[PDB]
Subunit: 163 residues, 3 copies
């Protein structure tokens, strides 16, 4: 038991109940979980990095071994800085599987200690992605069933500001 530290990277724009479920599950299996929020300058996110970090901390801060860090460059550099055991990614559908399989092979060529582990969503969260939730919210749809309360309120603020 060298002690395990797993990185869960994403743009979390915004965090959803799918992300909550995977972090919770991962937190039971590894000693440390780092929610790693990519700044994502290109494909420019709806919520600022600061807001996305705040939402994540609010939604998952009850788990004592979960840390929240914003990061900018490449996953493989971050993995090495963080001395991580593995990266964790959720797999929803075949398009996620093919993309992640490719990226894991790329990151392994860049760093032979890279490792990627995957979880599949619990059946009730299986369609939830941030992209879908943004689409619904932009059409003034109710996203209350799919995201934490702080995220509903952040969308309210976005609507008050024109979006």
């Amino acid at each position: 038991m060298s002690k395990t530290r797993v990185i869960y990277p994403g743009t979390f724009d915004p965090i959803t109940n799918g992300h909550v479920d995977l972090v919770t599950r991962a937190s039971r299996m590894f000693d440390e979980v780092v929610v790693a929020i990519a700044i994502g300058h290109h494909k420019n996110p709806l919520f600022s990095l600061e807001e996305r970090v705040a939402l994540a901390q609010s939604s998952l801060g009850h788990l004592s071994n979960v840390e929240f860090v914003g990061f900018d460059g490449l996953l493989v550099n971050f993995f090495k800085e963080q001395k991580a055991t593995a990266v964790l990614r959720g797999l929803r559908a075949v398009s996620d599987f093919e993309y992640e399989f490719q990226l894991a092979n790329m990151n392994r060529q860049l760093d032979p200690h890279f490792e990627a582990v995957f979880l599949t969503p619990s059946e009730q969260y299986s369609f939830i992605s941030s992209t879908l939730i943004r689409e619904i919210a932009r059409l003034k749809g109710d996203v209350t069933k799919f995201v934490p309360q702080a995220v509903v309120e952040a969308f309210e603020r976005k609507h008050q500001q024109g979006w």
Copy 2:
């Protein structure tokens, strides 16, 4: 004998011979078929909502039980307002199947009376999508084999206007 009403939602940008075949098929099986054209403000369409509705009406007017309606894009609310039996989608490829499977599960959680039924294209239309036809037409390709006459003429007008 309960009356069935099925919604066929899309951006129809423009309507193609693929959409004509699915609507025709659906019209034979359900009492009422609503071609429901999402305004789609974001991912902004080539043709205006009014032009897309005109193209659809002119291409499907020979079917007596088809209605043509623009809507905002929020499908589950539209389904309820329309008192529909089901939403109809065409499935061309595995990417369509995965996405529609997910959205059907999402819409069912938002409304437990939601229903989605699917058709696959007839083999001669199986590669046709609006997206592909726009791309061909933009490169000054002949799309006459793939779309109704009114659409060919609409593309001509687009080219005369610089596109």
Copy 3:
């Protein structure tokens, strides 16, 4: 014993080691291989057409039966002008297979002598796409493992110019 001429079309933005491996393999099997670089005005490329042609020449010019040509408009027209035997595409993953199956069917309806042949990548190149390489390079990642030397140097030039 007829001469074969195969077109390998793409945006090559930039050319990668994946493309190099497919062209090398194709050059052993066909008499003439035409690296055909679509100008691609829409989805506007990082590298100019002239730079993309020069990179491809630099990376593959050691194979004496490979030609390098820019084109605009439709692939099927270019195929006819070039009196080609077939178009060659690489298939990396299921999403490539679906898209190329569709386009082959569509191009055959536009020209019944169209033909498309496919190769799968060698296992060490199987994740590499121009889109991935651009993403990594934009985040200041090292792409040296995945692209020819000429492309690494073209990215250097891009960084010196602000990108």
